[PDB]
Structure 1
Amino acid sequence: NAMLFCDDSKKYLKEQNINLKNEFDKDDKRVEKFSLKHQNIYFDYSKNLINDYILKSLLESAEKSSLKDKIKQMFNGAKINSTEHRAVLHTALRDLSSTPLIVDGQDIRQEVTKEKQRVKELVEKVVSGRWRGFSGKKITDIVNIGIGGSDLGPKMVVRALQPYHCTDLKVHFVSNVDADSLLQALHVVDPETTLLIIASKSFSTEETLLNSISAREWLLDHYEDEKAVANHFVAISSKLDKVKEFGIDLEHCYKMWDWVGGRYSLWSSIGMSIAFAIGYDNFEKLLAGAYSVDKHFKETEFSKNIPVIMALLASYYSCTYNSQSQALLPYDERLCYFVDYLQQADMESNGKSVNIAGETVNYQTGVVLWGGVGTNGQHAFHQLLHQGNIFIPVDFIAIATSHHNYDNHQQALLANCFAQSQALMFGQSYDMVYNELLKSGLNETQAKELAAHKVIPGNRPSTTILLDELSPYSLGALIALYEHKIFVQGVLWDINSYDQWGVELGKKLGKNILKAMNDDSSDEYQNLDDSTRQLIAKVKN
């Protein structure tokens, strides 16, 4: 009996027939109405297909929903991950309020602070040269071993904050079970000067198991002494018992709690590889940026709340226009893994077919998130954004100031960013094109023939999110905005954003198939569908 977001009312707000050009021409307060600021982030949603009436209707749905209660429940540690009976407390990992928070018998403020102090001490000991390898040498390289949430957030952040690297360590990310991943690291590191991190909440992920065992075999092939493990491995894991079976001391094991989802874990000890690149001070700045957005999100009325507006716009489009994807276009090379990261956060959260009560929902939930770095994407897929016939909401991320003095490059980068949202809004009509082709020197026949092919419909929506700079703090704020967008969408859809039951089956079938690959007399082999059986046969012959 939760409120229905995608109802008849929404599907009919569309009938306002918003024309963006007309709105900007007639409403001199358009930008003021449909933009917000949070510190040095400017959120301009004024090129969206909205007016006052549509935004009001959307905000009413939010106000009528359980959202206000759910925000409080998330921050207070209520078990909002209902199918796993877990709290959802990535927010606590970056808290600066120091308000009381006791969850499941633990003082969360103490737990989080003490674990940060441990990671900080590890990083300082390694960077200072107090940590030595087994043969007595200073560490020069860090290799993170993990997949999904134990890989992508740290990898994305390390790249995004490349200008802030300052520890003299090189940080490498091993993830896929495809041994190419492990080999790219091993080919450029020395066992005597490398610290390996096993990043695994469960300590039983197939890929990370094989990678970690293989890395240990490489280390021990070199040293020929099991005692070397102590100087060359640390672990992060919620499952402290499996860490000791692998051979790692508790003093080299870092905590991860059940209330930290993998795809919300970069803020935890899982982010230690971030700290090993940019230093612990900068890691604190990253967390502080996120905290600023957490405070905004928790305290701000919905009509002025950036993540709530992001969520309402996205769910409005996917409900009313039946769009099945959203495009995210970061106009900075440093953000090259940002789409990949948000794919995980968004799609694994909101790709759900049942509501909290377990009922199959009759409305569409999470859509495909995709995109690409600008300006490059302009020469790859923006043709489709401009002249295709797919409805796709677009977010642009712009960074006002970069990390260098090529000011002509930076100005062109921004001009392009802004031109692309302007082009989506305006398009170009048959009459504009036809007249332009005549002025180019085409005769009437030629111009008539070509003009239709150059028509760009326009009236296509976008949001632009402008940062003053891409720093640890502003990046942390940017990520947190999207974390909260995703939460709001899940609440409005009445789904559990924080479980992931859909992946279990493939893990089981994978074990079965590996058995079938190694024994064709097995029940596993006999029960295969014939597509799977012949694929296995082809990778033997």
Structure 2
Amino acid sequence: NAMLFCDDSKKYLKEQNINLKNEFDKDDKRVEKFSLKHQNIYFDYSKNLINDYILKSLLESAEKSSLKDKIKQMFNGAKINSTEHRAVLHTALRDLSSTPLIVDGQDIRQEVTKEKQRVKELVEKVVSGRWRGFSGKKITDIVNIGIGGSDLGPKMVVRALQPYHCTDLKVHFVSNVDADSLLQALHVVDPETTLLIIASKSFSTEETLLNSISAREWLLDHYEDEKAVANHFVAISSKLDKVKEFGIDLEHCYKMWDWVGGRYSLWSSIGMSIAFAIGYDNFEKLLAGAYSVDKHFKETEFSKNIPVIMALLASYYSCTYNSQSQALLPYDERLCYFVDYLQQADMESNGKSVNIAGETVNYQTGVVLWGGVGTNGQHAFHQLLHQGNIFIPVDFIAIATSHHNYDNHQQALLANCFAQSQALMFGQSYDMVYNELLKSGLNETQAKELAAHKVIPGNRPSTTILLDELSPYSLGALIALYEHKIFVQGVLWDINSYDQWGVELGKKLGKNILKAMNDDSSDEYQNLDDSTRQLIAKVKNK
């Protein structure tokens, strides 16, 4: 009996026929109305296909929804992951309020703080040289072994904060079961000077276990002494019984809690590899930026609340325009893994077909998130954003100042970012193009033949999120904005953003296929569909 977000009312808001050029021409307060600031982040949503009526209508839907309650329930540790009967407490990982929070018999404040102190001590011991490898050498390289939630956040953040690397350690990420992943790391590191991290919430993920067994075999091939495992492996998991069973002791294990979703886990001990690159002080700054956004989200009325606006715009488009993707365009090289990271956060959360009650919903839920770094994307796929006939909401991320003094490059980067959003809004008409072609020296027949092909329809929406700089703090804030957008979207759609049951079937079928690949007289092999069977046969013959 949850409020329906995607209803007939939303579908009709579209009939306002918003014309962006016309709104900016006539409304001298358009930017003031449709922008927000949070500390060093400027959120400009003024190039979206909205006016006062449309926005106020969307805000009224949020107000009428359960969102106000759900926000409190998330922060207070209510079991809002309702299919798994778990709290959803990635916010607690970065808390600076110190308000009382007792969940599942644990003092969450004490739990979080204590594990942070342990990670901090580990990083300090390793960087200072007090931790030595088994042959007594100082560690020079860190290898994280993990996949999905146990890989993407650390990998993305270590890249994004490259200018802040300061530990004299090189950090490597092994993830895919494809052994190329492991081998890219092992080919450039020395077993005597490498600390390996097995990062797995479940400690049962096939790829991570295979990779960890292979890494252990490599280490033991070198040392020929099982005691070497003590100086070269640590583990991050919620299943410490399984870590012990693997052969790593509890003093070498760093716990995470069931209420830390993998795709919201970089803030936890899974972030260890981040601290190994940029130091623990910078890790605390990352956390503190996220906290600032948590406080904003929890405390701010919806009309001035950045994640709530982000969520309403996105769900409005995918409802009323029936769009099936969103483009995210980060105009900074350092954010090269940001789209990949948010693909997991967004699509693994909101790619759900049933509501909280288990009923199949008759409205579309999460859409495809894609994009690419600017300005490169301008030369790859912005052609489609400008002249294709697919409706695609666009977010630009701009960074005002970079880490170097090539000011001309930085100015051009930003000019391009702002030009792309301006181009989406304005387009260029047939008459404008035709006149330009004449002025360029084409005759009338040539101008008439070409002009239609150069018309850019325009009136296409964008949001620009401008950061003062890409620091640990501002990056933490930026990621949290999207975490909360995703949350708000799932609440409005009445889905569970925090489970991921859809991946189970593939895991099961993968085990059966491995059996079939090893024994064609097996029941597994006989029960395959013939496409799978013939794919297995084609691999065997090669």
Q: Same fold (TM over 0.5)?
A: yes
Q: Distance in 2 between matches of 1:205 and 1:435?
A: 62
Residue aligned with 2:195, SS: strand
Q: Distance in 2 between matches of 1:241 and 1:85?
A: 21
Question: CA offset at residue 242 of structure 1?
Answer: 1.0
Q: Distance in 1 between matches of 2:228 and 2:309?
A: 53
Question: CA offset at residue 245 of structure 1?
Answer: 1.5
Q: Distance in 2 between matches of 1:461 and 1:245?
A: 53
Question: CA offset at residue 428 of structure 1?
Answer: 0.1
Q: Distance in 2 between matches of 1:191 and 1:437?
A: 65
Deviations 1:410-435 (A, max 9, x none): 00000000000000000000000000
Question: CA offset at residue 451 of structure 1?
Answer: 0.2
Deviations 1:159-207 (A, max 9, x none): 0000000000000000000000000000000000000000011111000
Q: Distance in 2 between matches of 1:201 and 1:314?
A: 31
Deviations 1:9-49 (A, max 9, x none): 00000000000000000000000000000001000000000
Q: Distance in 1 between matches of 2:386 and 2:369?
A: 18
Question: CA offset at residue 247 of structure 1?
Answer: 1.3
Q: Distance in 1 between matches of 2:381 and 2:80?
A: 38
Q: Across the two proteins, how many residue pairs are aligned to each other?
A: 541
Question: CA offset at residue 518 of structure 1?
Answer: 0.2
Aligned to 1:215: 215
Deviations 1:444-493 (A, max 9, x none): 11000000000000000000000000000000000000000000000000
Residue aligned with 2:400, SS: strand
Aligned to 1:185: 185
Residue aligned with 2:197, SS: strand
Question: CA offset at residue 153 of structure 1?
Answer: 0.2
Deviations 1:319-359 (A, max 9, x none): 00000000000000000000000000000000000000000
Aligned to 1:399: 399
Q: Distance in 2 between matches of 1:202 and 1:424?
A: 44
Q: How does 1:302-341 map to 2 (within 5 A)?
A: 302-341=302-341
Q: Distance in 1 between matches of 2:222 and 2:239?
A: 29
Q: Does 1:78 align with 2:52?
A: no
Deviations 1:57-102 (A, max 9, x none): 0000000000000000000000000000000000000000000000
Deviations 1:356-375 (A, max 9, x none): 00000000000000000000
Question: CA offset at residue 107 of structure 1?
Answer: 0.1
Q: Distance in 2 between matches of 1:434 and 1:171?
A: 55
Q: Distance in 2 between matches of 1:55 and 1:94?
A: 31
Q: Distance in 2 between matches of 1:220 and 1:438?
A: 74
TM-score, with structure 1 as normaliser: 1.00
Question: CA offset at residue 112 of structure 1?
Answer: 0.1
Q: Distance in 2 between matches of 1:432 and 1:413?
A: 27
TM-score, with structure 2 as normaliser: 1.00
Q: How does 1:116-265 map to 2 (within 5 A)?
A: 116-265=116-265
Question: CA offset at residue 534 of structure 1?
Answer: 0.1
Deviations 1:104-136 (A, max 9, x none): 000000000000000000000000000000000
Q: Does 1:356 align with 2:372?
A: no
Q: Distance in 2 between matches of 1:275 and 1:162?
A: 12
Deviations 1:131-156 (A, max 9, x none): 00000000000000000000000000
Q: Distance in 2 between matches of 1:158 and 1:201?
A: 20
Q: Distance in 2 between matches of 1:177 and 1:118?
A: 30
Q: Distance in 1 between matches of 2:10 and 2:203?
A: 45
Q: Distance in 1 between matches of 2:172 and 2:442?
A: 56
Residue aligned with 2:84, SS: coil
Q: Does 1:372 align with 2:338?
A: no
Residue aligned with 1:401, SS: coil
Q: Distance in 1 between matches of 2:349 and 2:125?
A: 37
Q: Distance in 2 between matches of 1:482 and 1:506?
A: 28
Q: Distance in 2 between matches of 1:173 and 1:40?
A: 31
Aligned to 1:469: 469
Q: Distance in 1 between matches of 2:108 and 2:245?
A: 28
Question: CA offset at residue 246 of structure 1?
Answer: 1.5
Question: CA offset at residue 249 of structure 1?
Answer: 1.1
Q: Distance in 1 between matches of 2:22 and 2:241?
A: 64
Residue aligned with 2:468, SS: strand
Residue aligned with 1:369, SS: strand
Which ranges in structure 1 are unaligned for 5 or more consecutive residues? Answer: none
Q: Distance in 2 between matches of 1:316 and 1:403?
A: 37
Aligned to 2:424: 424
Aligned to 1:494: 494
Q: Distance in 2 between matches of 1:202 and 1:42?
A: 38
Q: Distance in 2 between matches of 1:20 and 1:131?
A: 60
Question: CA offset at residue 396 of structure 1?
Answer: 0.0
Residue aligned with 2:72, SS: helix
Deviations 1:203-259 (A, max 9, x none): 110000000000000000000000000000000010001111211111110011000
Which ranges in structure 2 are unaligned for 5 or more consecutive residues? Answer: none
Q: Distance in 2 between matches of 1:69 and 1:244?
A: 40
Q: Distance in 2 between matches of 1:27 and 1:242?
A: 62
Aligned to 2:526: 526
Q: Distance in 1 between matches of 2:312 and 2:203?
A: 38
Residue aligned with 1:134, SS: coil
Residue aligned with 1:540, SS: helix
Residue aligned with 1:46, SS: coil
Q: Distance in 1 between matches of 2:313 and 2:61?
A: 12
Aligned to 1:481: 481
Q: Distance in 2 between matches of 1:421 and 1:212?
A: 45
Question: CA offset at residue 264 of structure 1?
Answer: 0.2
Q: Distance in 1 between matches of 2:239 and 2:438?
A: 72
Deviations 1:501-520 (A, max 9, x none): 00000000000000000000
Q: Which runs of 4+ in 1 moved over 4 A?
A: none
Aligned to 1:535: 535
Residue aligned with 2:135, SS: coil
CA RMSD of aligned residues (A): 0.3
Q: Distance in 1 between matches of 2:202 and 2:502?
A: 17
Q: Distance in 1 between matches of 2:10 and 2:437?
A: 42
Q: Distance in 2 between matches of 1:245 and 1:482?
A: 37
Residue aligned with 1:465, SS: strand
Q: Distance in 1 between matches of 2:467 and 2:40?
A: 6
Residue aligned with 1:469, SS: coil
Residue aligned with 1:539, SS: helix
Q: Distance in 1 between matches of 2:157 and 2:311?
A: 23
